[PDB]
Amino acid sequence: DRKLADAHDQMLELAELLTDVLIKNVPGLSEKHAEDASIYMAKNRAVFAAAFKNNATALSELSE
Amino acid sequence: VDRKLADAHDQMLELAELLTDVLIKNVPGLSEKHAEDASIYMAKNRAVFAAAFKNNATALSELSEPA
């Protein structure tokens, strides 16, 4: 419920900071694409966290 | 000492490469060049991104302004 709504708040907040750093640092990248990419990663944060921390092959766990 | 900096830079690349691949497969309309660029950037700041994703989004504040 409310407990689940703040789940998303977390995810959304990260996505938003992310969209910024990317806009700032990838020349030519549109805002929309930056948003889409950030939401995708933020939505998948624990897998990315594990990838960034120790090893890339934790990206395996991404489902598609 | 420097072999470790060699191993780390390699791991940077291997990460940037897998990131590029997951991004072009998952963000429709994202170009290869842009996925590449953003992947290298994150990979070069992997410790700040790991902290961002692990808990506080706010650690991305520690990324300096673009050169």
mmCIF file with all atom_site columns, all heavy atoms in Angstrom, chain A residues 15-26:
data_model
loop_
_atom_site.group_PDB
_atom_site.id
_atom_site.type_symbol
_atom_site.label_atom_id
_atom_site.label_alt_id
_atom_site.label_comp_id
_atom_site.label_asym_id
_atom_site.label_entity_id
_atom_site.label_seq_id
_atom_site.pdbx_PDB_ins_code
_atom_site.Cartn_x
_atom_site.Cartn_y
_atom_site.Cartn_z
_atom_site.occupancy
_atom_site.B_iso_or_equiv
_atom_site.pdbx_formal_charge
_atom_site.auth_seq_id
_atom_site.auth_comp_id
_atom_site.auth_asym_id
_atom_site.auth_atom_id
_atom_site.pdbx_PDB_model_num
ATOM 1  N N   . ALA A 1 15 ? 15.943 7.545  -10.598 1.00 0.00 ? 15 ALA A N   1
ATOM 2  C CA  . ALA A 1 15 ? 15.713 7.787  -12.036 1.00 0.00 ? 15 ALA A CA  1
ATOM 3  C C   . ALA A 1 15 ? 15.943 9.240  -12.429 1.00 0.00 ? 15 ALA A C   1
ATOM 4  O O   . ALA A 1 15 ? 16.606 9.552  -13.443 1.00 0.00 ? 15 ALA A O   1
ATOM 5  C CB  . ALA A 1 15 ? 14.298 7.387  -12.428 1.00 0.00 ? 15 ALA A CB  1
ATOM 6  N N   . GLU A 1 16 ? 15.399 10.136 -11.618 1.00 0.00 ? 16 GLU A N   1
ATOM 7  C CA  . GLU A 1 16 ? 15.445 11.548 -11.921 1.00 0.00 ? 16 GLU A CA  1
ATOM 8  C C   . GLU A 1 16 ? 16.844 12.143 -11.793 1.00 0.00 ? 16 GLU A C   1
ATOM 9  O O   . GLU A 1 16 ? 17.244 12.932 -12.635 1.00 0.00 ? 16 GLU A O   1
ATOM 10 C CB  . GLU A 1 16 ? 14.502 12.259 -11.001 1.00 0.00 ? 16 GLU A CB  1
ATOM 11 C CG  . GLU A 1 16 ? 14.265 13.647 -11.416 1.00 0.00 ? 16 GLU A CG  1
ATOM 12 C CD  . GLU A 1 16 ? 13.713 14.449 -10.262 1.00 0.00 ? 16 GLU A CD  1
ATOM 13 O OE1 . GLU A 1 16 ? 13.194 13.805 -9.319  1.00 0.00 ? 16 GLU A OE1 1
ATOM 14 O OE2 . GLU A 1 16 ? 13.800 15.699 -10.273 1.00 0.00 ? 16 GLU A OE2 1
ATOM 15 N N   . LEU A 1 17 ? 17.581 11.787 -10.742 1.00 0.00 ? 17 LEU A N   1
ATOM 16 C CA  . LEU A 1 17 ? 18.985 12.241 -10.607 1.00 0.00 ? 17 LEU A CA  1
ATOM 17 C C   . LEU A 1 17 ? 19.805 11.666 -11.749 1.00 0.00 ? 17 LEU A C   1
ATOM 18 O O   . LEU A 1 17 ? 20.586 12.354 -12.399 1.00 0.00 ? 17 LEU A O   1
ATOM 19 C CB  . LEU A 1 17 ? 19.589 11.770 -9.296  1.00 0.00 ? 17 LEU A CB  1
ATOM 20 C CG  . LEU A 1 17 ? 18.783 12.254 -8.106  1.00 0.00 ? 17 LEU A CG  1
ATOM 21 C CD1 . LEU A 1 17 ? 19.197 11.510 -6.869  1.00 0.00 ? 17 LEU A CD1 1
ATOM 22 C CD2 . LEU A 1 17 ? 18.964 13.767 -7.939  1.00 0.00 ? 17 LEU A CD2 1
ATOM 23 N N   . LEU A 1 18 ? 19.595 10.390 -11.991 1.00 0.00 ? 18 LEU A N   1
ATOM 24 C CA  . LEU A 1 18 ? 20.213 9.714  -13.093 1.00 0.00 ? 18 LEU A CA  1
ATOM 25 C C   . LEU A 1 18 ? 20.004 10.429 -14.438 1.00 0.00 ? 18 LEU A C   1
ATOM 26 O O   . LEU A 1 18 ? 20.965 10.623 -15.194 1.00 0.00 ? 18 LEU A O   1
ATOM 27 C CB  . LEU A 1 18 ? 19.619 8.334  -13.149 1.00 0.00 ? 18 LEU A CB  1
ATOM 28 C CG  . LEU A 1 18 ? 20.472 7.144  -13.527 1.00 0.00 ? 18 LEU A CG  1
ATOM 29 C CD1 . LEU A 1 18 ? 21.915 7.587  -13.721 1.00 0.00 ? 18 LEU A CD1 1
ATOM 30 C CD2 . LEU A 1 18 ? 20.335 6.097  -12.427 1.00 0.00 ? 18 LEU A CD2 1
ATOM 31 N N   . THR A 1 19 ? 18.758 10.812 -14.737 1.00 0.00 ? 19 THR A N   1
ATOM 32 C CA  . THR A 1 19 ? 18.448 11.469 -15.993 1.00 0.00 ? 19 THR A CA  1
ATOM 33 C C   . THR A 1 19 ? 19.328 12.728 -16.121 1.00 0.00 ? 19 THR A C   1
ATOM 34 O O   . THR A 1 19 ? 19.839 13.068 -17.189 1.00 0.00 ? 19 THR A O   1
ATOM 35 C CB  . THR A 1 19 ? 16.960 11.855 -16.007 1.00 0.00 ? 19 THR A CB  1
ATOM 36 O OG1 . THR A 1 19 ? 16.152 10.660 -15.947 1.00 0.00 ? 19 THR A OG1 1
ATOM 37 C CG2 . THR A 1 19 ? 16.596 12.705 -17.226 1.00 0.00 ? 19 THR A CG2 1
ATOM 38 N N   . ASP A 1 20 ? 19.511 13.414 -15.012 1.00 0.00 ? 20 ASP A N   1
ATOM 39 C CA  . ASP A 1 20 ? 20.368 14.550 -15.029 1.00 0.00 ? 20 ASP A CA  1
ATOM 40 C C   . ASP A 1 20 ? 21.819 14.317 -15.318 1.00 0.00 ? 20 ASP A C   1
ATOM 41 O O   . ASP A 1 20 ? 22.420 15.108 -16.050 1.00 0.00 ? 20 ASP A O   1
ATOM 42 C CB  . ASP A 1 20 ? 20.298 15.249 -13.714 1.00 0.00 ? 20 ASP A CB  1
ATOM 43 C CG  . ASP A 1 20 ? 19.635 16.540 -13.842 1.00 0.00 ? 20 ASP A CG  1
ATOM 44 O OD1 . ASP A 1 20 ? 18.427 16.494 -14.160 1.00 0.00 ? 20 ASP A OD1 1
ATOM 45 O OD2 . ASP A 1 20 ? 20.324 17.587 -13.672 1.00 0.00 ? 20 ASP A OD2 1
ATOM 46 N N   . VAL A 1 21 ? 22.420 13.302 -14.702 1.00 0.00 ? 21 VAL A N   1
ATOM 47 C CA  . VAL A 1 21 ? 23.856 13.185 -14.850 1.00 0.00 ? 21 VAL A CA  1
ATOM 48 C C   . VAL A 1 21 ? 24.117 12.821 -16.300 1.00 0.00 ? 21 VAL A C   1
ATOM 49 O O   . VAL A 1 21 ? 25.081 13.286 -16.892 1.00 0.00 ? 21 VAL A O   1
ATOM 50 C CB  . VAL A 1 21 ? 24.558 12.223 -13.813 1.00 0.00 ? 21 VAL A CB  1
ATOM 51 C CG1 . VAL A 1 21 ? 23.918 12.300 -12.434 1.00 0.00 ? 21 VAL A CG1 1
ATOM 52 C CG2 . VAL A 1 21 ? 24.627 10.807 -14.291 1.00 0.00 ? 21 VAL A CG2 1
ATOM 53 N N   . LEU A 1 22 ? 23.205 12.045 -16.874 1.00 0.00 ? 22 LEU A N   1
ATOM 54 C CA  . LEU A 1 22 ? 23.330 11.538 -18.252 1.00 0.00 ? 22 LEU A CA  1
ATOM 55 C C   . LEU A 1 22 ? 23.172 12.666 -19.270 1.00 0.00 ? 22 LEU A C   1
ATOM 56 O O   . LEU A 1 22 ? 24.029 12.870 -20.138 1.00 0.00 ? 22 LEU A O   1
ATOM 57 C CB  . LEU A 1 22 ? 22.319 10.408 -18.525 1.00 0.00 ? 22 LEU A CB  1
ATOM 58 C CG  . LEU A 1 22 ? 22.522 9.113  -17.697 1.00 0.00 ? 22 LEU A CG  1
ATOM 59 C CD1 . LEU A 1 22 ? 21.378 8.059  -17.978 1.00 0.00 ? 22 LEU A CD1 1
ATOM 60 C CD2 . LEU A 1 22 ? 23.892 8.473  -17.859 1.00 0.00 ? 22 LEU A CD2 1
ATOM 61 N N   . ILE A 1 23 ? 22.085 13.418 -19.139 1.00 0.00 ? 23 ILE A N   1
ATOM 62 C CA  . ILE A 1 23 ? 21.915 14.647 -19.901 1.00 0.00 ? 23 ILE A CA  1
ATOM 63 C C   . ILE A 1 23 ? 23.194 15.437 -19.792 1.00 0.00 ? 23 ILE A C   1
ATOM 64 O O   . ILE A 1 23 ? 23.706 15.845 -20.815 1.00 0.00 ? 23 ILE A O   1
ATOM 65 C CB  . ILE A 1 23 ? 20.666 15.475 -19.433 1.00 0.00 ? 23 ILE A CB  1
ATOM 66 C CG1 . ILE A 1 23 ? 19.361 14.713 -19.743 1.00 0.00 ? 23 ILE A CG1 1
ATOM 67 C CG2 . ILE A 1 23 ? 20.648 16.879 -20.029 1.00 0.00 ? 23 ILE A CG2 1
ATOM 68 C CD1 . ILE A 1 23 ? 18.099 15.409 -19.281 1.00 0.00 ? 23 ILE A CD1 1
ATOM 69 N N   . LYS A 1 24 ? 23.742 15.610 -18.582 1.00 0.00 ? 24 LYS A N   1
ATOM 70 C CA  . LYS A 1 24 ? 24.947 16.437 -18.412 1.00 0.00 ? 24 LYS A CA  1
ATOM 71 C C   . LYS A 1 24 ? 26.154 15.845 -19.119 1.00 0.00 ? 24 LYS A C   1
ATOM 72 O O   . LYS A 1 24 ? 27.015 16.587 -19.586 1.00 0.00 ? 24 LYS A O   1
ATOM 73 C CB  . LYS A 1 24 ? 25.317 16.660 -16.930 1.00 0.00 ? 24 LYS A CB  1
ATOM 74 C CG  . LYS A 1 24 ? 24.515 17.714 -16.206 1.00 0.00 ? 24 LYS A CG  1
ATOM 75 C CD  . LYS A 1 24 ? 25.229 18.158 -14.920 1.00 0.00 ? 24 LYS A CD  1
ATOM 76 C CE  . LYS A 1 24 ? 24.574 19.389 -14.241 1.00 0.00 ? 24 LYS A CE  1
ATOM 77 N NZ  . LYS A 1 24 ? 23.181 19.066 -13.769 1.00 0.00 ? 24 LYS A NZ  1
ATOM 78 N N   . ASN A 1 25 ? 26.231 14.520 -19.192 1.00 0.00 ? 25 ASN A N   1
ATOM 79 C CA  . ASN A 1 25 ? 27.508 13.927 -19.558 1.00 0.00 ? 25 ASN A CA  1
ATOM 80 C C   . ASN A 1 25 ? 27.576 13.190 -20.879 1.00 0.00 ? 25 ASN A C   1
ATOM 81 O O   . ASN A 1 25 ? 28.669 12.964 -21.394 1.00 0.00 ? 25 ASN A O   1
ATOM 82 C CB  . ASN A 1 25 ? 28.035 13.066 -18.426 1.00 0.00 ? 25 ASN A CB  1
ATOM 83 C CG  . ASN A 1 25 ? 28.401 13.886 -17.216 1.00 0.00 ? 25 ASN A CG  1
ATOM 84 O OD1 . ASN A 1 25 ? 29.470 14.490 -17.150 1.00 0.00 ? 25 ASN A OD1 1
ATOM 85 N ND2 . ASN A 1 25 ? 27.521 13.902 -16.240 1.00 0.00 ? 25 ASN A ND2 1
ATOM 86 N N   . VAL A 1 26 ? 26.423 12.862 -21.460 1.00 0.00 ? 26 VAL A N   1
ATOM 87 C CA  . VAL A 1 26 ? 26.398 12.227 -22.786 1.00 0.00 ? 26 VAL A CA  1
ATOM 88 C C   . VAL A 1 26 ? 25.999 13.236 -23.869 1.00 0.00 ? 26 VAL A C   1
ATOM 89 O O   . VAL A 1 26 ? 24.814 13.525 -24.062 1.00 0.00 ? 26 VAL A O   1
ATOM 90 C CB  . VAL A 1 26 ? 25.474 10.983 -22.839 1.00 0.00 ? 26 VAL A CB  1
ATOM 91 C CG1 . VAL A 1 26 ? 25.893 10.087 -23.974 1.00 0.00 ? 26 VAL A CG1 1
ATOM 92 C CG2 . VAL A 1 26 ? 25.541 10.216 -21.542 1.00 0.00 ? 26 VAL A CG2 1
#
